[PDB]
Amino acid sequence: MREIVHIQAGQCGNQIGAKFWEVISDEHGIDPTGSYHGDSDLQLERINVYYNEATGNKYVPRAILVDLEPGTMDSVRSGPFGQIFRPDNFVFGQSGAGNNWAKGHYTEGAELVDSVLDVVRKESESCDCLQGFQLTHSLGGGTGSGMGTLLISKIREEYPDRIMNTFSVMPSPKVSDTVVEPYNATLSVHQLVENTDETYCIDNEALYDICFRTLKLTTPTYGDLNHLVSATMSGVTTCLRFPGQLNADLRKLAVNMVPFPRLHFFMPGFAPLTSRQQYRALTVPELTQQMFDSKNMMAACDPRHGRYLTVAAIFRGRMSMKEVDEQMLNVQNKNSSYFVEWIPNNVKTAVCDIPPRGLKMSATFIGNSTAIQELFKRISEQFTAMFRRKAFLHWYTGEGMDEMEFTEAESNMNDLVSEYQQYQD
Amino acid sequence: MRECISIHVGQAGVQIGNACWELYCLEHGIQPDGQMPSDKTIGGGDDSFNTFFSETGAGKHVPRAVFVDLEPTVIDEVRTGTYRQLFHPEQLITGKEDAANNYARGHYTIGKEIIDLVLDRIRKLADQCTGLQGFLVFHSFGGGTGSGFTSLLMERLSVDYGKKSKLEFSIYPAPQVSTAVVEPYNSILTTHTTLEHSDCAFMVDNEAIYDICRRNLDIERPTYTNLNRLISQIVSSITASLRFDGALNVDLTEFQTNLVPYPRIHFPLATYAPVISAEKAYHEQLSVAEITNACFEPANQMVKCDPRHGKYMACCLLYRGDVVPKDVNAAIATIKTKRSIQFVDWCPTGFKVGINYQPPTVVPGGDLAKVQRAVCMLSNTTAIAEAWARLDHKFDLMYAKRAFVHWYVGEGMEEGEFSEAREDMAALEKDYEEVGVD
Amino acid sequence: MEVIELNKCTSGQSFEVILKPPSDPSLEEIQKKLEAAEERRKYQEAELLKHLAE
Amino acid sequence: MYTFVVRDENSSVYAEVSRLLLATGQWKRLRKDNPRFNLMLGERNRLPFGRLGHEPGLVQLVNYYRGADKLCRKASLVKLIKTSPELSESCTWFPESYVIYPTNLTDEREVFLAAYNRRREGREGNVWIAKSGILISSEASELLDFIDEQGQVHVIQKYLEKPLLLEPGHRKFDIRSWVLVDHLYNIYLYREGVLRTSSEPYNSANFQDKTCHLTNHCIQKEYSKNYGRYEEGNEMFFEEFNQYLMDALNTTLENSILLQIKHIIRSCLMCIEPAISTKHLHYQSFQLFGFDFMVDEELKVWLIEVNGAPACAQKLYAELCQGIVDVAISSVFPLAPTSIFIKLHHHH
Ligand SMILES: Nc1nc2c(ncn2[C@@H]2O[C@H](COP(=O)(O)OP(=O)(O)OP(=O)(O)O)[C@@H](O)[C@H]2O)c(=O)[nH]1
Ligand SMILES: Nc1ncnc2c1ncn2[C@@H]1O[C@H](COP(=O)(O)OP(=O)(O)CP(=O)(O)O)[C@@H](O)[C@H]1O
Ligand SMILES: Nc1nc2c(ncn2[C@@H]2O[C@H](COP(=O)(O)OP(=O)(O)O)[C@@H](O)[C@H]2O)c(=O)[nH]1
Ligand SMILES: O=C(COC(F)F)N1CCCC2(CC2)C1
Ligand SMILES: [Ca+2]
Ligand SMILES: [Ca+2]
Ligand SMILES: [Ca+2]
Ligand SMILES: [Mg+2]
Ligand SMILES: [Mg+2]
Ligand SMILES: [Mg+2]
């Protein structure tokens, strides 16, 4: 009974989190009304990790929906599985955040945060042994970014010894809402560096290029991007939601993936990613070659530009586990120049007999690569291009911030990049 | 008759313990309900099996065992398993959240709060003993509980039972069946703080058990059940003398006498044979000399090393089945004339031999085939130091970068305890080279 | 090649073969170590809460 | 894609093998500390055998047999021959030898003096050579006093006083034979041997000048004045040495010398096979050996020493090195003749 409390904040946070619960709810046999209708007891074995059990055998997600405007959450409640979420778990305001980190963190957000902690405390008080929290949000907006990181800061104060995990969508000018996204992203990254144990970095540019080039989607939408994150989120959490000789709790995964407290930002990956030649059976070598290929990486970073500190791959479906080990040991022993030699056996593999819906077998990739520094390098350059001219700063100074706080975020991330550099040589 | 209290710490210890007592029951003729038809003395008796089993007035034979894990998933299997009736609920101790492979967590953070409860439950078994010999501690090197909480229990056992002996059955970390990257740290930490508290330690390297399962049992990807059913065969061979009538290794003290001439060098290598796949229609049964000859093949050693390039300090041959002393000496003679068995000049060049006529018991539905005769060789070679070398090297590669050290320091451990632990292993590796090399 | 101390019983026998002659921390000390690390945890957590309070 | 590491930058031999490996476009070299390797061209001293064969999914192969030092050491060989029943103390192809520890440190001093005094009284040639810095002398007092001056273990053995001298020149020589033992413990002998001949006339009335007595390529090239006269680099190859044996002695190199060399290589290597074999081992071993033989005026072959890290003749680096890749490395890691070796079959 190692429960996980889920929180989704903001537009991106809630639209992605919605599809996430849609995906795993299907994998566990939970219909849109919370009733179970699966056929394998493996579905219910660890069902209580993400769901509570109400009366009548009803399973209610352990999720807290947060946003500073009603719009996004209203859609979810009216969406496919909107009826499955606890009504009290909807915590929202009306002003909105205006894609302003200061509004989500200091002004609007501060007014609503105490009431979100009221629901978090209520979900925790029902847990037999809380593993920790997981947040899904974007960093370029104002609520998921500004108020999300304010939520983590306060959740880590009331639960200093619980694991704090985040799925964080990183902004990209190619997939942009506003020009202030680097400002918000740089301000959140420093918060995550301090108050998260694991952050899964998800770059919207990678999600977009995968949809255009690999999935062959002429005109990708936000929905299209959210499909990939949904599938990925289901993949990384497979070693949590199902039984296996792993016995992996959030803290155990952190202990074996994070060799240094600040370098806890991961690159996820998924395979296959087929275009509609979609029924063809994918072999184990093919799953492996793709899972480690950059075109299947969702951080928009070339691993061949850095070195892997640790790597964790999960294989789903009925397949030769022997053949699995063979191909994994072939990937490492064919490109050992990209794995650090000072962490013995830093590549681990888990297998799962239950594949995702509609796939005979897949593989989810979780890599702590020093190549992630290229991402923060992008954000830092876009941040400095505007900040040197103080462009758009008035939005933030008007909310109570000072330029000094921006300079600090600037440095605190450049330091982060520098830390990733030394461990890469 | 003197009693032996077995202690199982962590997942590896608990599951291995489950596999052994399953075997002890099949061997001693005990049913899952604790009933023993052959035991004519009901609810009492000072027989050789009573060293591991007590008896209730209702005729139940209850293991003298304690299961401890900082997380309840593994031990919940014992509570509802086949032999759930053997133990009473007091024998099974479980926690809420485990140690997350963090030695500092199982020893300090979490161990400090549960140590006094485990000792209390053990004291309940001691109070049923008329002359408690010692303890048999089963644990893993890599686990945060098995490594971190074990070393704390050992320190406290040396305090509450100063004159009692303590043997170990330790699982050496093998990448092929592990997802932990920090297992080298834990191993070197638990060996340092446990070294002066364990009188004799049998190390089993999963890498060795893994290949023995793939090679002999034709198992392409062995599970823990396979690895454990085999380890409880070796453990059975090493504990049989304490559970059966005999004269060799009749008490836990004899293990330190016959196998450990030097205190720190208390890690005998174990070799077992034959391991035959049951799926083989019918196997030609091996002779006393062939199974004894196998005891010097690196293939069936519990730790892969080259004993030829070491020096034996002691040597025990434990036979089970159709073996008479004549055959043993015949094989030994031929083996000395063909094998490279270099002893230390300050130790006799000899072999102690134990024979039990009951052949190895096989678990119905298991992997091992029923053989007419088998043997387990307990030899104390400097060659086992190869294991410490591999491990100490992996420790050095990570520690040079302080990788993962923040997790240990975060749980209250000082960074100095790392180097202090490492420096002890630098001394341990030195004691082995001084005794073997010229 | 010698055999010494041959003991026989109903369930087996044991003997020796010589091929060639030769040529703690008190209970108080542990409580301190345990509590010492507990104090270093409380100090580390204090500096965390002090950080968050700022 | 096979991978290997290099941990002996001085090995002229395997330096070539490593060069040929990369030439195949199928062998990738890794850092010397990268444990994910297939082939280890390991260091000479203190090679970490205990760390081999423990990488999941890697079949690892190394270029040194653990334990072969018993055969490639001055004192160890003497002990191995005197104690091993397969070689016995009456071995007829190894000069009488004795292990002599310096007095400032079992030891065979008295056992040596007994044979010495016997030879002195028997009017027989009593000239011995001490080594481990080499001394030749006929007075036992000088040989022992020299070892005591040193601090390391020395070995005193009979100096072949009737060595076969090549004409013209009247000059001493030795024969180097390279021998490769693969993982399956086959014994392959290189068809090309070299004679490191002395360019000075052998003089039996003066062991002080160790120039015509020590056929070492460095001594003839440093303290000899006729270096490179009769043959280039004081190195005569089997072709020439064979033609000489026929013209002068009316015999072949095969019948008069090679049969004994092939018999000495077998007896030595087979003797230690049970101690160093990697048949049922978690890793695999192979090694290149350099045997040094002496030939007397009776055409009898004697074993001087065995080199564990031998160098090759400048003219035979390409042929032998590639051959080391064919039967030693590629036999375990094949790539997607007329062998240049002579298999010495034996009972395993
Ligand atoms: N032979 C064998 N090894 C096991 C078994 N279970 C776990 N291991 C090994 O134990 C090591 C990890 O230690 P665990 O026993 O799982 O850890 P723990 O003692 O439960 O402590 P925690 O970290 O708190 O969970 C790994 O190297 C595993 O290969 C088992 O049943 N048999
Ligand atoms: N017992 C003996 N009888 C005759 N000559 C001898 C001898 N012992 C040594 N030599 C001479 O010494 C040379 C070999 O010396 P040795 O091999 O012992 O030293 P070393 O090992 O440093 C040279 P290498 O490179 O061949 O190993 C030969 O050329 C030989 O002529
Ligand atoms: N992958 C994905 N990214 C989104 C989605 N919606 C917005 N984003 C990204 O998130 C950033 C905008 O933040 P947003 O969540 O809309 O602001 P917030 O509601 O105040 O937190 C931009 O960089 C967008 O590219 C979505 O549905 N999917
Ligand atoms: O506060 C900001 C600044 O956003 C900027 F930081 F990205 N808003 C944007 C303009 C509309 C608004 C109501 C005033 C909200
Ligand atoms: Ca307001
Ligand atoms: Ca009884
Ligand atoms: Ca003690
Ligand atoms: Mg938006
Ligand atoms: Mg555990
Ligand atoms: Mg030499």
Task: Explain the overall architecture.
The structure is cut from a larger assembly and holds chains A (425 residues), B (438 residues), C (54 residues) and D (348 residues). Chain B is of the alpha/beta class and 438 residues long. Chain B folds into three domains: 1-268, no CATH class; 269-383, no CATH class; 384-438, no CATH class. Chain B is built from 14 helices and twelve strands. In chain B, the strands form three sheets. Chain B has a six-stranded parallel β-sheet with strand order 5-4-1-6-7-8, sandwiched between helices. In chain B, α5 (144-160) links the parallel β6 (134-140) and β7. The relative contact order of chain B is 0.12. Chain C is α+β, with helices and mostly antiparallel strands and 54 residues long. In chain C, 50% of the residues lie in helices and 31% in strands. Chain C contains one helix and two strands. The longest helix of chain C has 27 residues, at 27-53. Chain C is rod-shaped and about 80 Å long. With 348 residues, chain D is α+β, with helices and mostly antiparallel strands. Chain D contains eight helices and 16 strands. The longest helix of chain D is centred in the last third of the chain and has 24 residues, at 253-276. The radius of gyration of chain D is 21 Å and the shape is globular. Chains in contact: A-B, A-C, A-D, B-C, B-D. Chain B binds chain C through residues 104, 108-109, 111-112, 152, 155-156, 158-159, 162, 196-197, 244-248, 325, 328-329, 332-333, 336, 343, 345-358, 410-414, and chain C through 1, 3, 5-7, 9-27, 30, 34-41, 44. Residues 10-12, 15-16, 97, 99, 138, 140-145, 169, 171, 175, 177, 181, 204, 207, 222, 225-226, 229 of chain A line the site of guanosine-5'-diphosphate. One magnesium ion binds next to loops of chain A. It is classed as cell cycle. The entry lists the keywords cell cycle, tubulin fold, cytoskeleton, microtubule. The entry is titled "Tubulin-Z2074076908-complex".
